[PDB]
């Protein structure tokens, strides 16, 4: 197959390469360091006042529970960044997937250090986003419960609604019914709300003289028919292991508690149901590092996508479909760490033939049960008068139908720009790809900065035009200023990962290995057959 | 079994090879399944009662065949 | 298992032996030589006029596309032998089963040299019998298209009816729906009819400045409202790869085109669905060429079929069911190249007992999902007055329901004579055996030559006797003359295989080799449970 | 719904109108009187020699068997018309659908008068096509057995191949297994072949001193090991009813036999499986006979098909889809005698737009499980240099994948011309429409008369031109003249219907009543959900 090879056209030594690769690497270091700040949790401050109580820290608990040197894919680490008034580190909940007794598991634990471990609106959002990845990929769950309650001041966005707290219990009882084990490890307070996480769980573990599961803690209980009782007596470790039966395992401390936990995942009789014709893994043909310089620094500067392709696929072998047709979208088959995959990567605009090309590809992929890989870098659909009269509307629709209905495993990664209709036609957040990721250089928004200020301000002088007046360059310019800056702000990865519009910002030169981890993980769940809606011909 | 088996005619195997710097599309049509067998790194030839064994072994997309002192390499055309 | 052994009774050195063997090996050489003639195509003549155009010949495209040294089972090569006036070798279409990137595949391509590759009646029937085998056994399909049109002169037997052209597209889109990939490589003209073969196929490949897909070629298009255009501008390779979208891969030539196709079969993520308890493959206990002398030369001469069985099963191991009952039908289990098979071979007549024995066996075979092997050498059912008043009718019916309803893979080989009711009770052409073959010695007819000339002339003298007279040896002999010879001609393998009444004539001593290939190839598709109709007890 | 109304634009009194209606009704009376000829059977001659035996005639046994006054839809009456040397009325077997004990049943009985009832090649194709209609539409079966054997002179096209005789038994045992009762009433000779028809059927009835089921009648049995016995002693009515068990009911004679038969269908515990939301049946808005004048007399004369639609649907209400797009194909919803139907009638040529229009429509009905009705009047697809480079190829193809895959009841009526790719894209014979009918004014061929003479003679002067010659007005006029007429003749309804390329030629004026009957009949069998192949976008 020395024909399906992608021979590069990039010189790793060029000056222009070193230029891109430069500001790229900076971007990455930018992320690097932030992610470190977030590792601190509630700051050395109470974080140390934690270990004080003889409690192991969050991320420490995770590394102890994991398998010796197992990898760990973390989710939305930039969670709640510069979102709430105060600093709410990774939204006060660290979640990720990792090997635990030879099983790819979904793990979630609260950072008791971050504002008392309570649930801010996004803590809930992150928690629930985890149970999704969990139900969607059949990964058993391990809840390392150590939370206050729900953040009392912002309850309006934390208690009522459908996808608000309590939907945690919903997904939970449903996961235990669809046979995805629900394991609970209580290592702190667990008053009211989170009191159900361990109550509603196949198996539950408590740390003595530290764990506490009660509906109303002593503050609330005293505020009841008086009564003043201590934590340990109301709902301590010994009360629910020897008396009520809300817990199942009596652990002597944080380290014991996790060890007990491992054991549960051990008697799972678990077996993966995914199924692909995976082939032996063979590395790419170009250092995945070289990606740093393939991606231009000048945001709207044309580059060839196949370059990024050649540095992620196995042996940089890639067989291209409708090779020379609506080339704006590149489509092909290849393998990634064994797992075969079908790719759809943007390469520009997106005329009508590009979506018919892509919709036709998704049919072949969905017909062979091969995973889908979307690489977004779309600026939008070519507009025009003949273009619109040509059905760039209905054909675009053709694409989205195919994407929205495709039931094989979908994976998306933003390496350019998610803008307008494009985001949807390329499996954007709303199409439930098993995982959605974002590169440091990529920006997302309904449409360009000035693009929106363009129209938004245009109409203002169209309504003010047939109103016997006109828009003076003084008011129009004050109409666009606020927009031109807003857009630039909410188009940035941090802003995005901060609100969970993606499961995290990643290292461009690490992509290949993230995809392998994911793909494999999603094979814990059967590749279901696909049923398409009506295609608007 | 890549023996080139066929319905009623003889075993057919068309090979698009290349040794030195001259490609040849070899047509292998043997009705008498003999001629050259090969075990380990050695090609055994039953050249009319007089069996002889010349070394040959492959590595990657290349096969080395010691033919008359020389050690020529043959590989597949693309 | 040193007892389920078949110890031969044949003396390989015997004079009588080499006797039969003589004329047997002679018939085989008769076939060997015609087949060779058929590989000529439209004859050296235009065959060279073909390579003239820089186009690889059909049988060559085939060998270049196959796995290095892979086997190839051809389909009805004697197709249309001496059928139409002219000589249309292998019906202007070659097709068979062979490995392509490790998948047992169905390949069909037209011989541009044979009367312009146009579709003669039997061409269409051949092309469809290929897609039966492909749907029946779930084998991906590669059509190497290079045909003229449909043979205009005989359109009434090529265009309309269900079984005609156009059922080619029907079968295509149905297969595509059933998930049996559909690939097309156009390497020549492809006007009107064949124009849909590429258009209706998951993936399509074209040779530039050679291929051409247009509904109406220049002849017919000038015949429209004038207009005079070249073939390549009308529907060239460049037109349908850069502009229209009726093609997907842009090939530089026949060799490229074929290697391009391989790659498509490569990412098929294909897996076999069949599944038996196959075991270590062990060879016969007697050389399979010994057969040539096992089969007597005097057509009406009895021999023991268990002799042809000992030269096909593994280790000539055969456990016989209802050993000594209705002996006219031998029944037993064995293995063939690993794969376990249930055999049913004729040993003479076929009294009621042989049918009951045969029905009860199929039942066992069907309940254990063991494939079926039928060895046809039946002359008919035993007649008479007490034989009929004994239910030979109903009983023979019991064997027919069982065969018709049996849903595990069935395989028939004609090793003697297929005559009358026998042909049906023994899985004939009409009971959909996956594959059905014929030896050079076997003859198929509704009844023997004179046997039918018997009745036919008989009533002629009974309608003429209750009419006041009779048939004199003068007119009665002139009524049996024609029949006697017509039957001898319509019963010969070449006459049969020409009309596809079978998937070809084979070398008696290769029988085993074909069967294993066949079996394996039908495991590409699942062995379904079986449901019987009502059994008239 | 006073808007879904189709107001006519034709004048019933116009002269141009009575013009067409004239030549139309002339054709229908031509068919009418031909049909009467065929109801004669083997001519007054033998026919009477039949009733002499005390045997009820075929078409009589039928009317006796049906429910008082029930309708009867005959199948291919013009069967084998001017096909065999001699005359073989309705191909020696009458078949059709009629109510028996309140169940829509498929009935087939042979005409012992026609060449001794023996099976000529087409007699087999008929019997078989009948069991297809029976399988596909889940109608129990009544076989009124009274045949000789198989037309011995023409055995080569009656015994061997897949869909030859013997495929009868196949279909039977299968239908018997899918729970579709198989009944048999033997009212005459039944030697050899047809010996299974009663042997292999759930319930069986014989007429005493008249029915005879034996594998070898006495002609055959004397030519066996001597012995001479009578017909009734060998396998009479009393042999198989008291001794063997090949039959189940002892009938006194024809009238009795059919009454016994009625009773079986009586205890079938039968229930219909289809299910549509049909409404109260309301008649058209314009006399159905007005069609005669709707159809222009000049075959190549453009007219509006809605006018024929208006005369078939209920209340002449028709809701049109993509009203004004690719108007060449009209599509819409309506009802017909209650039952809801989706229509597709040709109106001219057929460029890309029309196909997409039609594929998108099929999607909609396939999704709501509404039956499909195709009205063929297609001359072909629009040819051209641009029309080709635009995908008129791949677009016509989306249409057929759609048609071929549709699993709701498909219905076809030829009211114009079936030519070329047109026939396929409009559910032609090859797409399994449950039933396919022809008007007497409609003509079918792979292409027009001279259109084929155009190209077949064209290449003759291009082969002979790049050959240093040219074809003079005298050799090219002699290559075209025979083709010019060959097509005219092999295009006529009788030509068609005689070969079963349709289930009959009908009365333009009764179309609606036939379709009503068919639909209902097709509802004895469930409406399947549909799975589409890949659509080449
Ligand atoms: C959870 C709890 C045991 C904390 O124990 P602790 O380890 O001693 O932690 P502290 O009391 O020091 O709490 C420190 C932080 O927790 C925050 N906090 C705790 N519970 C909170 C709540 N429900 N809402 C908002 N903030 C809360 C406080 O705002 C405080 O913030 P600060 O560090 O910036 O000053 C205690 O706050 C408690 O009993 N809360 C009950 C929560 C509840 O009843 N929730 C019901 C709603 S589901
Ligand atoms: C197919 C075609 C391109 C041939 O190209 P080519 O490689 O130059 O081959 P030639 O033109 O030399 O054809 C030679 C033979 O083809 C035969 N032939 C080609 N098309 C034929 C057809 N449709 N019907 C009958 N014969 C045909 C000719 O009879 C000729 O026979 P001959 O060698 O005994 O004299 C050309 O015949 C053509 O354009 N035909 C179109 C076919 C068509 O329109 N069919 C539609 C029906 S669905
Ligand atoms: C069928 C049979 C009983 C006819 O009884 P019948 O009502 O007296 O009718 P007749 O014998 O007068 O038959 C008249 C016609 O039947 C035709 N016929 C009958 N069986 C035929 C057969 N098997 N093949 C060809 N023609 C046959 C004769 O050609 C004759 O034609 P004709 O009128 O032009 O001279 C008698 O022909 C018979 O016994 N046939 C057995 C058929 C058989 O054994 N076929 C086995 C093949 S599956």
Kindly summarize this structure in a few lines.
The PDB classes it as ligase. The structure is cut from a larger assembly and holds three copies of chain A (537 residues) and one copy of chain B (78 residues). With 537 residues, chain A is of the alpha/beta class.
Folded structure, characterized:
This is part of a larger assembly, with three copies of chain A (537 residues) and one copy of chain B (78 residues). Chain A is α/β, with parallel strands linked by helices and 537 residues long. Chain A has two domains: 1-274, 2-enoyl-CoA Hydratase, Chain A, domain 1 (Alpha-Beta Complex), CATH 3.90.226; 275-537, 2-enoyl-CoA Hydratase, Chain A, domain 1 (Alpha-Beta Complex), CATH 3.90.226.10. Chain A has helices at residues 15-39, 43-52, 58-65, 121-136, 167-177, 196-199, 218-222, 231-235, 239-242, 254-266, 291-294, 306-310, 352-368, 385-389, 394-405, 421-425, 449-463, 473-489, 493-498, 511-521, and strands spanning 72-74, 93-99, 104-110, 141-147, 182-191, 203-207, 212-214, 249-251, 319-321, 329-336, 339-346, 372-378, 410-419, 435-438, 443-445. In chain A, strands 1, 2, 3, 4, 5, 6, 7 and 8 form an eight-stranded mixed beta sheet that branches. In chain A, strands 9, 10, 11, 12, 13, 14 and 15 form a seven-stranded mixed beta sheet that branches. In chain A, helix 4 (121-136) links the parallel strand 3 (104-110) and strand 4 (141-147). In chain A, helix 4 (121-136) packs parallel to helix 5 (167-177), helix 13 packs parallel to helix 15 and helix 17 packs antiparallel against helix 18 (473-489). The longest helix of chain A is centred in the first third of the chain and has 25 residues, at 15-39. Chain B is an all-beta fold. Chain B has one domain (1-78): Glycoprotein, Type 4 Pilin. Chain B has no helices and seven strands. Chain B has strands at 11-19, 22-30, 36-39, 42-47, 50-59, 62-67, 70-76. Chain B has a seven-stranded antiparallel beta sheet, with no helix packed on it. The two termini of chain B are 23 Å apart. Classes of the chains: A alpha/beta (537), B mainly beta (78). Chains in contact: A-C, A-D, B-C, C-D. The interface between C and D is large, with 104 and 108 residues. One coenzyme A (COA) sits between chains D (112, 115-116, 118, 148-153, 189, 191-193, 217, 219-220) and C (446, 455-456, 459, 463). The PDB classes it as ligase. The entry lists the keywords biotin carboxylase, carboxyltransferase, bt domain, bccp domain, ligase. Crystal structure of P. aeruginosa 3-methylcrotonyl-CoA carboxylase (MCC) 750 kD holoenzyme, CoA complex.
């Amino acid at each position: 197959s020395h024909m399906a090879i992608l021979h590069t056209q990039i010189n790793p030594r060029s000056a222009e390469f070193a230029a891109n690769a430069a500001t790229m690497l900076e971007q990455v270091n930018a992320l690097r360091t932030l992610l470190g700040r977030i590792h601190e949790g509630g700051g050395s401050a109470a974080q140390a006042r934690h270990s004080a109580r003889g409690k192991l820290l969050v991320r420490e608990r995770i590394n102890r529970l994991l398998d010796p040197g197992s990898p760990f894919l973390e989710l939305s680490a930039l969670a709640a960044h510069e979102v709430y008034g105060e600093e709410v580190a990774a939204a006060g909940i660290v979640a990720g997937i990792g090997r635990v007794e030879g099983v790819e598991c979904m793990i979630v634990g609260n950072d008791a250090t971050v504002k008392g471990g309570t649930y801010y609106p996004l803590t809930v959002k992150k928690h629930l986003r985890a149970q999704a990845i969990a139900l969607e990929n059949r990964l058993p769950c391990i809840y390392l419960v150590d939370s206050g309650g729900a953040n009392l001041p912002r309850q309006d966005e934390v208690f009522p609604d459908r996808e608000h707290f309590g939907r945690i219990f919903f997904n939970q009882a449903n996961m235990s019914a669809r046979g995805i084990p629900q394991i609970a490890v209580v290592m702190g307070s667990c008053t009211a709300g989170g009191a159900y996480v361990p109550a509603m769980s196949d198996e539950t573990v408590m740390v003595r003289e530290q764990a506490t599961i009660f509906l109303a803690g002593p503050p609330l209980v005293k505020a009841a028919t008086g009564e003043v009782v201590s934590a340990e007596e109301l709902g301590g470790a010994d009360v629910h292991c020897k008396v009520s039966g809300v817990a199942d395992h009596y652990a002597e401390d944080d380290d014991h508690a996790l060890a007990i936990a491992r054991r549960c995942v051990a008697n799972l009789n678990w077996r993966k149901q995914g199924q692909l014709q995976c082939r032996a893994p063979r590395a790419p043909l170009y250092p995945a590092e070289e990606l740093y310089g393939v991606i231009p620094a000048d945001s709207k500067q044309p580059y060839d996508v196949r370059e990024v392709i050649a540095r992620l696929v196995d042996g940089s072998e890639f067989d291209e479909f409708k090779a020379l047709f609506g080339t704006t979208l590149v489509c092909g088959f290849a393998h990634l760490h064994g797992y075969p995959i079908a790719i759809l990567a943007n390469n520009g605009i997106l005329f009508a033939e590009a979506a018919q090309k892509g919709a036709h590809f998704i049919e072949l992929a969905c017909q062979r049960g091969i995973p889908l890989l979307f690489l977004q870098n779309i600026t939008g659909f070519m507009v025009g008068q003949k273009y619109e009269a040509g059905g760039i509307a209905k054909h675009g629709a053709k694409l989205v139908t195919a994407v929205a209905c495709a039931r094989v495993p979908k994976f998306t990664v933003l390496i350019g720009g998610s803008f307008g209709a494009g985001n949807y036609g390329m499996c954007g957040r709303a199409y439930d790809p098993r995982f959605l990721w974002m590169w440091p250089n990529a920006r997302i928004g309904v449409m360009g900065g000035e693009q929106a200020a363009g129209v938004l301000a245009q109409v203002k002088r169209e309504q003010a035009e047939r109103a016997g007046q006109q828009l003076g360059v003084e008011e129009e310019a004050k109409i666009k200023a606020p927009i031109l800056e807003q857009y630039e702000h909410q188009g940035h990865p941090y802003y995005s990962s901060a609100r969970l519009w993606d499961d995290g910002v990643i290292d461009p030169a690490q992509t290949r290995e993230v995809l392998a981890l994911a793909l494999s993980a999603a094979l814990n769940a059967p590749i279901e057959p696909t049923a398409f809606g009506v295609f608007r011909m | 079994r890549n023996d080139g088996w066929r319905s009623a005619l003889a075993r057919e195997s068309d090979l698009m090879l290349r040794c030195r710097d001259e490609r040849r599309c070899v047509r292998l049509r043997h009705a008498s399944p003999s001629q050259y067998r090969l075990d380990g790194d050695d090609l055994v030839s039953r050249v009319d009662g007089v069996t002889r064994r010349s070394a040959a072994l492959r590595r990657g997309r290349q096969l080395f065949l010691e033919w008359e002192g020389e050690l020529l390499a043959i590989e597949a055309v693309d």
